[PDB]
Design brief:
This is part of a larger assembly, with chains A (110 residues), B (215 residues), C (195 residues), D (205 residues), E (48 residues) and F (177 residues). Chain A has one helix at residues 42-48; strands at residues 13-22, 27-36, 52-63, 66-78, 84-89, 101-104. With 110 residues, chain A is mostly beta strands. The longest helix of chain A is centred in the middle third of the chain and has 7 residues, at 42-48. Chain A is globular. Chain B has 215 residues and is of the alpha+beta class. The longest helix of chain B has 18 residues, at 171-188. Chain B is extended, with a radius of gyration of 26 Å. Chain D has helices at 20-33, 51-63, 80-91, 97-104, 129-132, 142-149, 154-190; strands at 11-14, 37-40, 46-48, 106-108, 139-141. In chain D, helix 1 (20-33) packs across helix 4 and helix 2 packs across helix 6 (142-149). Chain F is built from three helices and six strands; from the N terminus they run ββαβββαβα. The two termini of chain F are 30 Å apart. The chains are: A mainly beta (110), B alpha+beta (215), C alpha+beta (195), D mainly alpha (205), E mainly alpha (48), F alpha+beta (177). Chains in contact: A-B, A-D, A-F, C-E, C-F, D-F, E-F. Bound molecules: magnesium ion (12 copies). Chain A binds three RNA strands through residues 19-30, 33, 42-43, 46-47, 49-50, 57, 59-66, 69, 71-72, 74-82, 84, 88-98, 107-108, 110. Chain C: One of its GO terms (biological process) is maturation of LSU-rRNA from tricistronic rRNA transcript (SSU-rRNA, 5.8S rRNA, LSU-rRNA). Chain C: Keywords: Ribonucleoprotein, Ribosomal protein. Chain C: Residues 37-87 form the Large ribosomal subunit protein uL30-like ferredoxin-like fold domain. Chain C: GO terms for molecular function: RNA binding; structural constituent of ribosome.
RNA sequence: AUCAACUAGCCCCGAAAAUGGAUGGCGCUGAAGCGCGCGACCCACACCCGGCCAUCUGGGCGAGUGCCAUGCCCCGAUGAG
RNA sequence: GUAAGCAGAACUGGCGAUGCGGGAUGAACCGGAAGCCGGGUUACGGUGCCCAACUGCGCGCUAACCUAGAACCCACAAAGG
RNA sequence: AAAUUGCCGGGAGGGAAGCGGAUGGGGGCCGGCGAUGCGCCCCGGCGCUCGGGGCGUGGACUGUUGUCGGCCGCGCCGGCGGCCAAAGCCCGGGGGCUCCGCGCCCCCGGCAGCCGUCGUCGGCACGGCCGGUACCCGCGCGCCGAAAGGCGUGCCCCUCGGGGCACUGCGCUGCAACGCCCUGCGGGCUCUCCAUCCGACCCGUC
């Protein structure tokens, strides 16, 4: 903790991928569901509505010198009364992504 | 009052007043001038097979991008993206193309005067007095790239030859940084602790909710 | 349009004037029962008694969440009586009528649905009826006029949005908790979320 | 129940006097969202309904066995850790890869086996007995149920917990001593620094 | 905004009394209840 | 703020008929959720009592009664007729509430809880602010004392708003009445 | 302060079947049960807007700088089998 | 006809010929009918987990030492205490 | 040729496999997979094409931002009308209760602050998806202004602030800024394998 190695500033709030917008017997892979760490209510996700996020994973082959990958997306609208958001990405996430971390920056700010 | 502005703009009489048909009733008699048949080129080098279309001079005149209300010349901003993410800088003035123009100052942050998009900055409630700084010398051409030719591929032999040479930002930008940095440090020492503040970088330590955080 | 607006406020003050005067003079004033209904269908085209299917085809409600304007009279209100489980209907006011006409106004022009985006369409659909602008059309509907038949048959059934904020149970009547039948003043409350 | 969203590497849960079903639904949603839990002192879980009702329920659960091969059908566990684990398996879709990877994150123990002794044990307010039952309704402890069902290690867990409790009493008295000395140290610095430290006064308590 | 004679005297006191008198009369006929002197077996239960 | 019920008073009469061209006027004090529901319940009662149906009837006015002093607590009495699963019954219910409107909503919920009677089944015969020293019912009359005092045996712990709500709280809550 | 009757809400008795067993499962007891509510939310190929395909209707295009004219352009509705 | 997932009739609708959302599963029960896509909002049905939505805000009732009870059809229980 | 078998290389497997929709990870394969050419100029000879320099530019794909429209959702604020509007607050007056929840309950008459329901008018802030122009918008034919934009005359209104109306003509009329990469460990693929979430009973038939 003290004298640690890693990123020295976090300008992004963590979030967990939580699934897809799904009915009881359908999935709509176009939009994913995201839980932002620290947001608990429907009004507060109205602030993040717009602030883009990044799914950062890492593949097996090295391309452009790195295994790390990034898929880009943003918080479209709230999803429910408990601070869950719908996230729209450039290309739909893998189903394996649910449960993993996602970075939610503040770029399109105000 | 966007609607009231729209009505006042849309009124026929005020459309006359804006388009200034008067003082066109000045030059060309007391009647509106005629137009003619320009463009007598009569020299087409080549006849395209498909129906001919010429290039557009965009006659549309976009509104300049508006600045945030909470941004005033003299604010301390928070960078968000790029290599300077988290750096706390000073907003000097909005340059003419629509982007913010900021300074570190370069002595303390290492962020020079640089152009940053308004999207990727956050206003802070702090203000500095920069009445005494000269900025008019700054413009878009100051930053216009004039990117060189794509025949240079950066190889291993150039990787550190560029680093061990100084064929980089030319000396007048160096000189410029000195004057702005001095003329703004003199006013930064007036506010206590602000030198340390700008030296710091903004980090979102655990249990910090941005929407809860004021700025 | 100036004079139509002027008589809108004149009538609105006139109703209060009359009611206050009646209270002052000892009795009470009975408001004049509404001349106009807004009917909006709330049940789909599936599993309909054929007589009801005909009633809706005659009212011009041939798809769920369509809206029509109706004269009040014993001929038509006893027609709604026969088909209440399928419509919700009541008393439109000025805002509801005008903003239906503006934001969702289409005209049955030569059997085609022409959007009412300019004053010129009315010159073609009407103009043998002394209706020239959108505001004439709105007035001549709302204050049910001598030409209301033509200025309604000119209108195409309003193809409305699904109710924002939801909808109570469509199975029961509005009195019992549901949504069909008279909600006389509250079609106004519903239109702002159908539209 | 949406998920805590905490970023801890593991979350340790002091399951004493919580409700089996609700603690298990909260934990199940944590696991499905991907957060690794470690539920300790599982033997102390309170369950609504009398001990007699839970006894009868668990013996109905015992009669259920595959006729033609008993070893194949229901596997009737007895340890409180395993009974809770089965309960959470009830809420997790364990016939899918997501489901089995979900239960992989779940470690349930009786007592608090180290290295979970020297770890703050987070409780779930959404399931405490005090806040979830009306004081006066009969309930039972999962440990007392399992003892009466065929778990033969009740005495062992009691022995290990009495040892752990006294060993923690000693350390807590040590931290009382250290805390009073640190209180003295906080005032030592406070009366040493005056105007230099006013700024913390309106946000201190 | 600066306390001009924003809405001033609008009506004389003498008719401003009769208007309120008619209002109270209407409210009395509005909240008046039936005497319930028709239910000769439920008089005790109804209270009168 | 919002009241689920409102007490209206509704006046109506038969249509004018060229025999007896001035029909008699009927006033009623109704509870309903809104104007149209009050009117629809009004024609119910005149049809089953005065033999007047809406088609051969005429609505003269609907007005909504409000409470004199919402800021004072009042002992209310409601004599009500209801339909059980096997017949009809007559009840008296006493409440304490700042408004008759709130007391009536209290009574509908209490009837739907104690007797599984839905609102379509309840007819409110009579409402009267039965002041104290005359309340017949133990639950009301036991609150009639100055120097009243008692604890909160039952109080929820819950974040003041939803934002403070966390799944994990390191410390056991401290409850004390 | 008390007694008796009557009445109806939930619960209990009444209440017995064969592979092990089904409020859908776990579980639930200031409920995650029952009755009545209040907000908001979640959910169809339904409803509104927009893009495109097709069908159907209605149009425009020659003293032709004129067109797979069986063509191109435009408007409106619709699309299950 | 004792009754029948029984036989024969009347008005209507559905299935057959029909997907789709809900009722856990069901040809005809509830919503609803459909070109292929993006966006929004809904119907029926729900918001503890499975499972997207509240362990939301209120008030009572129930304690089941019988598998307490928990969805229109519906998958039942009575007379009586 | 397929069925079917072998060997080599790859891939994956807790009582089926196969198939549909998502991408993701592997492969394998695509340079029409993706551009370097236009205008202006001066020679140097062959007004025109090529050789040299200067010149402003310009390309697949992809990204961010801005501004206009369209549709949509969400939050905040203000004003007005209606009701007998009541109420608390400030002032007054009138009843019944008799030791009582008791310095109680009820009722009316003045007032000039905030405060329910229903209706209505408006202001603002955030965001999502689509669109980017031959017509609606918009630009030029005057000036000032980097620019948003401001500037004329005459008649009506309040007469402060300013507001409203007016004479009206020719033309032209595909919104922009800046990036990333360009034979790459690149880009993307409708092909192949595999994983994961959702769906999913085996067809023909009476
Ligand atoms: Mg919504
Ligand atoms: Mg519903
Ligand atoms: Mg039905
Ligand atoms: Mg009983
Ligand atoms: Mg057949
Ligand atoms: Mg959709
Ligand atoms: Mg969920
Ligand atoms: Mg072969
Ligand atoms: Mg095997
Ligand atoms: Mg597949
Ligand atoms: Mg792939
Ligand atoms: Mg916009």
């Amino acid at each position: 903790v003290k004298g640690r190695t890693g990123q020295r500033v976090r300008l992004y709030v963590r979030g967990t991928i939580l699934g897809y917008k799904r009915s009881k017997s359908n999935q709509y892979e176009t939009a994913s569901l995201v839980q932002i760490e620290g947001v608990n209510t429907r009004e507060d996700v109205a602030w993040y509505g717009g602030k883009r996020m990044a799914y950062v994973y890492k593949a097996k082959t090295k391309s452009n010198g790195t295994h790390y990958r990034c898929i880009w997306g943003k918080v479209s609208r709230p999803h429910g009364n408990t601070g869950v958001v719908r996230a729209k990405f450039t290309s739909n996430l893998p189903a394996e992504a649910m449960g993993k971390k996602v970075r939610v920056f503040m770029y399109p700010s105000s | 009052s966007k609607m009231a502005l729209g009505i006042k703009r849309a009124s026929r009489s005020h459309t006359y007043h804006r388009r200034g048909l008067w003082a066109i009733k000045a030059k060309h008699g007391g009647a509106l001038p005629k137009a003619e048949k320009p463009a007598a080129v009569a020299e087409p080098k080549f006849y395209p097979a498909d129906d001919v279309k010429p290039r557009t001079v965009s006659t549309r005149k976009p509104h300049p991008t508006k600045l945030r209300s909470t941004i005033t010349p003299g604010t301390v901003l928070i960078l968000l993206a790029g290599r300077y993410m988290g750096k706390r800088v000073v907003f000097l003035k909005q340059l003419q193309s629509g982007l913010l123009l900021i300074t570190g100052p370069f002595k303390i942050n290492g962020v020079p005067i640089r152009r940053v998009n308004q999207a990727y900055v956050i206003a802070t409630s702090t203000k500095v007095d920069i009445s005494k700084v000269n900025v008019q010398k700054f413009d878009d051409k100051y930053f216009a790239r004039e990117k060189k030719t794509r025949a240079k591929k950066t190889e291993g032999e150039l990787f550190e030859s560029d680093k061990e040479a100084t064929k980089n930002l030319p000396d007048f930008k160096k000189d410029d940084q000195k004057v702005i940095d001095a003329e703004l440090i003199k006013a930064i020492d007036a506010v206590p602790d602000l030198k340390n503040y700008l030296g710091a970088r903004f980090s979102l330590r655990d249990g910090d909710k941005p929407h809860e955080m004021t700025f | 349009a100036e004079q139509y607006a002027g008589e809108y406020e004149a009538q609105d003050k006139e109703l209060v004037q009359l009611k206050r005067e009646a209270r002052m003079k000892g009795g009470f004033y009975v408001s004049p029962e509404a001349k106009l209904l807004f009917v909006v269908r709330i049940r789909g085209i599936n599993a309909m008694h054929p007589k009801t299917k005909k009633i809706l085809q005659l009212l011009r409600l041939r798809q769920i969440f369509n809206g029509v304007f109706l004269k009040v009279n014993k001929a038509t209100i006893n027609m709604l009586r026969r088909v209440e489980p399928y419509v919700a209907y009541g008393y439109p006011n000025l805002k509801s009528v005008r903003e239906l006409i503006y934001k969702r106004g289409y005209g049955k022009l030569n059997k085609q649905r022409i959007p009412l985006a300019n004053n010129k369409v009315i010159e073609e659909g009407l103009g043998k009826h002394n209706i020239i602008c959108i505001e004439d059309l709105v007035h001549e509907i709302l204050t049910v006029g001598p030409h209301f038949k033509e200025a309604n048959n000119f209108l195409w059934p309003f193809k409305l949005k699904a109710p924002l904020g939801g909808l109570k149970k469509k199975r029961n009547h509005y009195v019992e908790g549901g949504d069909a039948g008279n909600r006389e003043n509250y079609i106004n409350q519903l239109v702002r979320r159908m539209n | 129940v949406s998920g805590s969203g905490v970023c801890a590497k593991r979350v340790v849960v002091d399951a004493r006097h919580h409700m089996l079903g609700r603690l298990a639904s909260i934990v199940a949603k944590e696991l499905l969202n991907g957060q690794r839990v470690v539920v300790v002192r599982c033997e102390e879980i309170c369950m609504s309904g009398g001990l007699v009702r839970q006894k009868m329920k668990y013996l109905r659960f015992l009669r259920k066995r595959m006729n033609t091969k008993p070893s194949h059908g229901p596997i009737h566990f007895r340890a409180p850790a395993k009974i809770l684990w089965r309960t959470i398996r009830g809420m997790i879709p364990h016939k899918t890869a997501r489901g089995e990877a979900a239960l992989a994150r779940l470690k349930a123990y009786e007592g608090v086996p180290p290295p979970y002794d020297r770890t703050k044990r987070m409780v779930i307010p959404d399931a405490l007995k005090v806040l979830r039952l009306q004081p006066g309704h009969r309930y039972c402890l999962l440990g007392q149920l399992s003892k009466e069902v065929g778990w033969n290690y009740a005495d062992t867990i009691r022995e290990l917990e009495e040892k752990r409790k006294e060993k923690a009493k000693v350390s807590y008295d040590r931290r009382k001593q250290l805390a009073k000395l640190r209180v003295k140290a906080e005032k030592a610095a406070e009366e040493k620094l005056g105007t230099q430290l006013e700024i913390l006064a309106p946000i201190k308590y | 905004k600066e306390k001009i004679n924003s809405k001033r005297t609008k009506l004389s006191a003498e008719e401003a009394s009769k208007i309120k008198a008619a209002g109270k009369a209407w409210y009395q006929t509005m909240i008046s209840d039936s005497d319930y002197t028709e239910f000769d077996v439920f008089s005790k239960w109804l209270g009168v | 703020v919002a009241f689920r019920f409102h007490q209206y008073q509704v006046v109506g009469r038969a249509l004018p008929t060229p025999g007896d061209e001035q029909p008699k006027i009927y006033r009623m004090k109704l509870w309903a959720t809104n104007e149209v529901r009050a009117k629809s319940k009004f024609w119910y009662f005149l049809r089953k009592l005065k033999k007047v149906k809406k088609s051969n009837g005429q609505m003269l006015a609907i007005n909504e009664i409000f409470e004199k002093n919402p800021t004072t607590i009042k002992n209310y009495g409601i004599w009500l007729r209801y339909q059980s699963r096997t017949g009809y019954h007559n009840m008296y219910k006493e409440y304490r509430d700042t408004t008759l409107n709130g007391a009536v909503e209290q009574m509908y919920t209490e009837m739907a809880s104690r007797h599984r009677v839905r609102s379509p089944c309840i007819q409110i015969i009579k409402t009267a602010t039965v002041n104290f020293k005359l309340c017949k019912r133990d639950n009301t009359k036991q609150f009639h004392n100055s120097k009243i005092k008692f604890p909160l045996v039952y109080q929820k712990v819950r974040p003041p708003t939803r934002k403070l709500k966390t799944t994990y709280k390191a410390t056991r809550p401290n409850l004390f009445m």
